Amino acid sequence: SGFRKMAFPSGKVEGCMVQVTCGTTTLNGLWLDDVVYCPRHVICTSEDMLNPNYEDLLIRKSNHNFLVQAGNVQLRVIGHSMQNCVLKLKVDTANPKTPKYKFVRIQPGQTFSVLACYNGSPSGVYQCAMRPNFTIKGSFLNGSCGSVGFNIDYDCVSFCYMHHMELPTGVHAGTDLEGNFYGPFVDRQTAQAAGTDTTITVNVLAWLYAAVINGDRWFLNRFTTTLNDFNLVAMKYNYEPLTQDHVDILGPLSAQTGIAVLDMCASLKELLQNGMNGRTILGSALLEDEFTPFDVVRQCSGVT
Amino acid sequence: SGFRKMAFPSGKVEGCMVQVTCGTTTLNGLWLDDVVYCPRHVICTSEDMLNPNYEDLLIRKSNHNFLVQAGNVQLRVIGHSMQNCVLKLKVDTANPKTPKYKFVRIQPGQTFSVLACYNGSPSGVYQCAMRPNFTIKGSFLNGSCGSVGFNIDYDCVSFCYMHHMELPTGVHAGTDLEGNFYGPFVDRQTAQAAGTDTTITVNVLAWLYAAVINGDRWFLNRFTTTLNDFNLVAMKYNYEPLTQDHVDILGPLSAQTGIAVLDMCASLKELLQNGMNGRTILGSALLEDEFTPFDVVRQCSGVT
Ligand SMILES: *C(=C)CNC(=O)[C@H](NC(C)=O)[C@@H](C)O
Numbered sequence: 001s002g003f004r005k006m007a008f009p010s011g012k013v014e015g016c017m018v019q020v021t022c023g024t025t026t027l028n029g030l031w032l033d034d035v036v037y038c039p040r041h042v043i044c045t046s047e048d049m050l051n052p053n054y055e056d057l058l059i060r061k062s063n064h065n066f067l068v069q070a071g072n073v074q075l076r077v078i079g080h081s082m083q084n085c086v087l088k089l090k091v092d093t094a095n096p097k098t099p100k101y102k103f104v105r106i107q108p109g110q111t112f113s114v115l116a117c118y119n120g121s122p123s124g125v126y127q128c129a130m131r132p133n134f135t136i137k138g139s140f141l142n143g144s145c146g147s148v149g150f151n152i153d154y155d156c157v158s159f160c161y162m163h164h165m166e167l168p169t170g171v172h173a174g175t176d177l178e179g180n181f182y183g184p185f186v187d188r189q190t191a192q193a194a195g196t197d198t199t200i201t202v203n204v205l206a207w208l209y210a211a212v213i214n215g216d217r218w219f220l221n222r223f224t225t226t227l228n229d230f231n232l233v234a235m236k237y238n239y240e241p242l243t244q245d246h247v248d249i250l251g252p253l254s255a256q257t258g259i260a261v262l263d264m265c266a267s268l269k270e271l272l273q274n275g276m277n278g279r280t281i282l283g284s285a286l287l288e289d290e291f292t293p294f295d296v297v298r299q300c301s302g303v304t
Numbered sequence: 305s306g307f308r309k310m311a312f313p314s315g316k317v318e319g320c321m322v323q324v325t326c327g328t329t330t331l332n333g334l335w336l337d338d339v340v341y342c343p344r345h346v347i348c349t350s351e352d353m354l355n356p357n358y359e360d361l362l363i364r365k366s367n368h369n370f371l372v373q374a375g376n377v378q379l380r381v382i383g384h385s386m387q388n389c390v391l392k393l394k395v396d397t398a399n400p401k402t403p404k405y406k407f408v409r410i411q412p413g414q415t416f417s418v419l420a421c422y423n424g425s426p427s428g429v430y431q432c433a434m435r436p437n438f439t440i441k442g443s444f445l446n447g448s449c450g451s452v453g454f455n456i457d458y459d460c461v462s463f464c465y466m467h468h469m470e471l472p473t474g475v476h477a478g479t480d481l482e483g484n485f486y487g488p489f490v491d492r493q494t495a496q497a498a499g500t501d502t503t504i505t506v507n508v509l510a511w512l513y514a515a516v517i518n519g520d521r522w523f524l525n526r527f528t529t530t531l532n533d534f535n536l537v538a539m540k541y542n543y544e545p546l547t548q549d550h551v552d553i554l555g556p557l558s559a560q561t562g563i564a565v566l567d568m569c570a571s572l573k574e575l576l577q578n579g580m581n582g583r584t585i586l587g588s589a590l591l592e593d594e595f596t597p598f599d600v601v602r603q604c605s606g607v608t
């Protein structure tokens with residue numbers, strides 16, 4: 001019993017973190033096989049960041065200008081290329097701790113663990129969600145760039161995020177491991193504003209299921225609703241529309257608790273309309289939306 | 305910027321987790337050097353748990369009755385002893401991944417990371433606090449016993465907790481690594497009720513400092529208070545008394561923000577008395593008390 005904002009064990013990713021220095025810029029890289037992946041803004045001065053031409057800045061850079069340090073041992077860079085907003089540095093040594101891995105581009109609402117790193121060294125691990133506006137609400141100081149987000153399926157690390165940017169509002173933007181930004185963001189020090197940070201409705205419902213499973217039941221009501229009726233109220237509260245696909249995904253949690261998905265929608269509708277009245281659910285005074293249905297099943301079943 | 309409930313990177317502890325089986329009971333052990341530490345209730349049937357005599361149950365157990373598996377390789381048990389509520393199993397192989405480590409007994413209000421494990425395998429990592437009633441609010445399913453709590457100082461893992469028990473209220477109890485329970489709890493399936501779960505005042509103040517550092521400032525008021533005046537209001541709201549020792553500990557956060565500790569106490573006093581009025585602080589609708597002053601400094605400075 002109990003339900004915690006839980007990250008994946010980080011060891012498999014700790015074994016991939018290196019330091020990348022180009023001139024006076026230091027950030028983190030991800031060493032998988034004989035490639036080190038890092039944000040391409042490693043080549044920029046903060047002056048360059050105001051309006052960088054990355055192809056032009058890269059002409060001035062050779063293999064030997066990219067200083068890669070794994071623990072306190074230097075890796076020899078034998079190649080470099082730009083792919084979208086990441087640099088791939090070919091090194092002469094395969095990472096011996098390379099886990100089974102994939103690169104995935106996640107959808108908004110999907111959750112992942114972040115291993116916050118400085119100078120190629122792990123500082124901490126926390127759980128994030130890709131917001132519907134393609135930001136994440138992270139904890140990232142200067143030097144944290146190249147920190148990665150990941151999911152683990154048994155022995156396979158799926159890398160879904162690399163940290164690049166803080167917006168002036170202090171929310172975070174980054175790329176998949178192909179170097180494509182999530183959302184419309186660019187690796188330039190210019191005015192970039194996030195869109196509406198809507199609530200991930202299917203995640204709130206999963207977490208309400210998690211609450212019922214863990215004995216928190218006060219909010220269960222005598223009502224049901226329809227997707228269309230629910231969605232009219234959802235829109236009013238800046239909640240994402242609920243689709244039949246989301247209902248299908250919540251099926252196993254419905255089965256386990258015996259609470260029809262649309263019944264739990266009607267409970268959520270009343271919580272939105274009435275508020276919490278000073279009550280808590282799983283120790284939160286607001287509706288949590290950074291647990292996926294898959295996260296709730298995983299934590300509630302003890303997957304390793 | 306941003307402030308997250310962040311755990312220590314877990315890799316160093318992942319390398320210590322093993323499976324311990326005695327008869328039909330399986331749980332987790334911690335392998336450090338040539339010793340495996342696990343809850344002594346590994347020797348119990350759930351029938352035994354109603355009123356176990358551990359010394360008598362242990363007479364029936366030999367080295368070869370303790371099945372220790374590290375990854376999918378069996379360790380040879382060459383010795384066993386009971387220390388308080390833990391068993392120490394001497395194995396013929398030093399754990400090659402043994403980190404620098406210490407055993408510490410933490411105080412209430414102190415935070416630590418938990419690596420939740422099943423069958424000696426890591427499922428996830430999350431941040432906890434030792435509650436003032438010496439429970440923790442964990443996420444622990446059957447099989448999670450022997451999961452450990454820890455802090456890391458650079459390269460040294462300080463192990464402070466081993467999971468033993470869920471109270472009927474679904475809160476958690478356990479021991480330090482000497483096998484001494486935190487609080488009055490016993491490893492027996494009997495009515496054990498937790499005392500008052502008070503709020504860790506010094507931790508709330510640290511987190512209010514964290515909020516100011518990260519741009520959340522709406523709750524800063526025009527008032528100050530005294531420790532005695534603050535404490536009269538604290539007691540009314542089931543907050544722990546604030547001592548001069550806590551004021552001293554918050555000194556660096558005071559210095560960094562220029563907000564006198566007693567000024568921040570007066571802000572907290574108004575938040576207790578007025579509530580949040582539907583507002584949030586660092587994305588919480590309640591006052592967070594599972595960040596220590598040391599945690600806020602660490603996360604705000606990016607220690608590795
Ligand atoms: C992103 C991580 C860019 N890197 C930095 O800003 C570095 N800052 C610190 C404090 O490490 C800088 C040395 O390049």
Ligand SMILES: *C(=C)CNC(=O)[C@H](NC(C)=O)[C@@H](C)O
Binds near residue numbers: 328446448
């Ligand atoms: C504490 C972890 C005691 N262990 C258990 O209850 C085990 N349960 C599961 C599901 O692993 C049992 C096999 O001994």
